[PDB]
Amino acid sequence: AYTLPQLPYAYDALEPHIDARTMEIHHTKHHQTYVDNANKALETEFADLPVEQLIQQLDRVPADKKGALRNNAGGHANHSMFWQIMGQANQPSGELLDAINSAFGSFDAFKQKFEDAAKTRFGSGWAWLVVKDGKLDVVSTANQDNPLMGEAIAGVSGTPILGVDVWEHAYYLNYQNRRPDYLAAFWNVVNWDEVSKRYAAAK
Ligand SMILES: [Mn+2]
């Protein structure tokens, strides 16, 4: 059903912002296990949907496969997006920048807001820039929850166009407890061409 997608770049392509050993473990170990356990939970009538569509249909799948698919289909969708919105000062332009200035006042203030949501995510989770009713918004989720899941499951909603992984596995080898330093580094590896593309597709 699902497979591990290939990275668009080498494991060391994001140095020194994210370390190569982390990129390799994160991808070949953590994401792989999300795929494995998602596939095992789908082996069911929902195994033909792409992961992005499945996680919109969780309140629908059996009551007892729901936790495993949420966590694991969630983890697959999230990490799959995550590799694609990174790439080797760095900022958006065009319509996405205009919408950022409209929703948050400025690129610099959007960053602050995105960082703050990432920092106050207590425990494991993600921070997201989403499109909701045509407008940009910053939110976060717990664990492998995704805003595509809806308000009831995820506690928030919208279509993610960018996300940052703040599970500790995402930054502990390079930054230990220093999440904020990880978050500042993350800005240097965002691929805003890809994010601009996702914004066009979702507005
Ligand atoms: Mn992760």
Curated annotation (Swiss-Prot):
InterPro entries from the UniProt entry: Mn/Fe_SOD, Mn/Fe_SOD_BS, Mn/Fe_SOD_C, Mn/Fe_SOD_N, Mn/Fe_SOD_N_sf, SOD_C_sf
Cofactor: Mn(2+)
Cofactor: binding details: Binds 1 Mn(2+) ion per subunit.
EC numbers: 1.15.1.1
Coiled coil: none
Keywords: Manganese, Metal-binding, Oxidoreductase
Biological processes, Gene Ontology terms: removal of superoxide radicals
Record GO terms (molecular function): metal ion binding; superoxide dismutase activity
Catalytic activity: 2 superoxide + 2 H(+) = H2O2 + O2
Positions with a binding annotation for Mn(2+): H26, H79, D165, H169
Keyword Transport: no
GO cellular component, as recorded: cytoplasm
Xref: SUPFAM superfamilies: Fe,Mn superoxide dismutase (SOD), C-terminal domain, Fe,Mn superoxide dismutase (SOD), N-terminal domain
One Pfam match: Sod_Fe_N
Domain of life the protein comes from: Bacteria
Quaternary structure (record): Homodimer.
Family that this chain belongs to: Belongs to the iron/manganese superoxide dismutase family.
Its job: Destroys superoxide anion radicals which are normally produced within the cells and which are toxic to biological systems.
Protein's recorded name: Superoxide dismutase [Mn]
UniProt source species: Deinococcus radiodurans (strain ATCC 13939 / DSM 20539 / JCM 16871 / CCUG 27074 / LMG 4051 / NBRC 15346 / NCIMB 9279 / VKM B-1422 / R1)
